[PDB]
Write an enzyme that holds these catalytic residues in place. Sequence first.
Site, PDB file in Angstrom:
ATOM      1  N   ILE A 123       0.858  -1.195   0.000  1.00 19.38           N
ATOM      2  CA  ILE A 123       0.000   0.000   0.000  1.00 19.38           C
ATOM      3  C   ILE A 123       0.888   1.236   0.000  1.00 19.38           C
ATOM      4  CG2 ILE A 123      -1.634   1.379   1.351  1.00 19.38           C
ATOM      5  CD1 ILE A 123      -2.969  -1.231   2.220  1.00 19.38           C
ATOM      6  N   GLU A 144      -2.108  -8.516   3.453  1.00 11.38           N
ATOM      7  CA  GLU A 144      -1.616  -9.732   4.122  1.00 11.38           C
ATOM      8  C   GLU A 144      -2.580 -10.914   3.856  1.00 11.38           C
ATOM      9  OE1 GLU A 144       1.284  -9.650   4.633  1.00 11.38           O
ATOM     10  OE2 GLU A 144       2.011  -8.277   6.173  1.00 11.38           O
ATOM     11  N   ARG A 149      -1.960 -12.223   0.453  1.00 12.21           N
ATOM     12  CA  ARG A 149      -0.727 -13.022   0.411  1.00 12.21           C
ATOM     13  C   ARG A 149      -0.871 -14.426   0.970  1.00 12.21           C
ATOM     14  NH1 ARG A 149       2.029  -7.717   2.628  1.00 12.21           N
ATOM     15  NH2 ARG A 149       2.900  -6.758   0.693  1.00 12.21           N
TER      16      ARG A 149
HETATM   17  N1  LIG Z   1       2.470  -0.548   3.325  1.00  8.32           N
HETATM   18  C1  LIG Z   1       2.333  -1.923   3.255  1.00  8.32           C
HETATM   19  N2  LIG Z   1       1.546  -2.550   2.331  1.00  8.32           N
HETATM   20  C2  LIG Z   1       1.458  -3.907   2.266  1.00  8.32           C
HETATM   21  N3  LIG Z   1       2.109  -4.727   3.147  1.00  8.32           N
HETATM   22  C3  LIG Z   1       2.898  -4.222   4.123  1.00  8.32           C
HETATM   23  N4  LIG Z   1       3.641  -4.730   5.125  1.00  8.32           N
HETATM   24  C4  LIG Z   1       4.233  -3.734   5.817  1.00  8.32           C
HETATM   25  N5  LIG Z   1       3.877  -2.559   5.268  1.00  8.32           N
HETATM   26  C5  LIG Z   1       3.042  -2.773   4.233  1.00  8.32           C
END
Ligand SMILES: Nc1ncnc2[nH]cnc12
Length: 246
Positions: free
Chosen positions: A71, A160, A163
């Site tokens: 992001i 997350e 993923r």
């Molecule tokens: N800005 C972000 N976007 C996606 N995953 C992440 N993990 C840590 N920061 C993140």
Amino acid sequence: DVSFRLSGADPSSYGMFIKDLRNALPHTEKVYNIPLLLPSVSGAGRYLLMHLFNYDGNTITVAVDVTNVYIMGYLALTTSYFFNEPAADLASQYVFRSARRKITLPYSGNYERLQIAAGKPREKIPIGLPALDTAISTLLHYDSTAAAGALLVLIQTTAEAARFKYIEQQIQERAYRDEVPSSATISLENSWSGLSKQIQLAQGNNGVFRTPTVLVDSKGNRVQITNVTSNVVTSNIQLLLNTKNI
Ligand SMILES: Nc1ncnc2[nH]cnc12
Ligand SMILES: *[C@@H]1O[C@H](CO)[C@@H](O)[C@H](O)[C@H]1NC(C)=O
């Protein structure tokens, strides 16, 4: 673009959003049957826009880098917000150009800076669909401290979950009640890059990791992942960060 509405949301509609988010990320190759994210993508095409709507139907648009699911920033009414880091500054050249003003948040987007900004580690921040609704609401009105916490919620419940299927299921379990992430969830979040690298190196190493990945499991136990026959590889991880980006 992909969309999610908290109004009337349930485990099913959230699962559909996470499926849409995964399907919007481009790949030309699967490695061990897992989509391999691209080394890079040029121009505006690098950025997916997620439209999120809180329970009252107010919206933010979130910009996500399709190569690493990161992001970079978001738009709320006419103001854009971007993390304070070079990758987000680059993103700001391509997305939300029509915003009336642009605020750079007083932190980068990594978990360590966000947790410092929020005053708590994400072990202590409840997540779930109600927390996501709160996070969208918070981001609608600029408050940098409150925003850090909301961004921790937003990252875990979107990126997350895309993923890792296990994380998506954790959030589905939290459709109507928030709960801090399991340590298994925390473990996976922290290992994505490591896993992604090892799954790619297993190719040409008969499916065996060059370096084992240490995770925590469901029952709270610390396990070593050494090869692609692991459930983490077969039935959990849904996307691989390209080693060219590691
Ligand atoms: N800005 C972000 N976007 C996606 N995953 C992440 N993990 C840590 N920061 C993140
Ligand atoms: C691979 O992983 C499993 C645990 O998931 C382990 O028990 C097994 O012995 C390993 N196989 C190889 C070839 O290393």
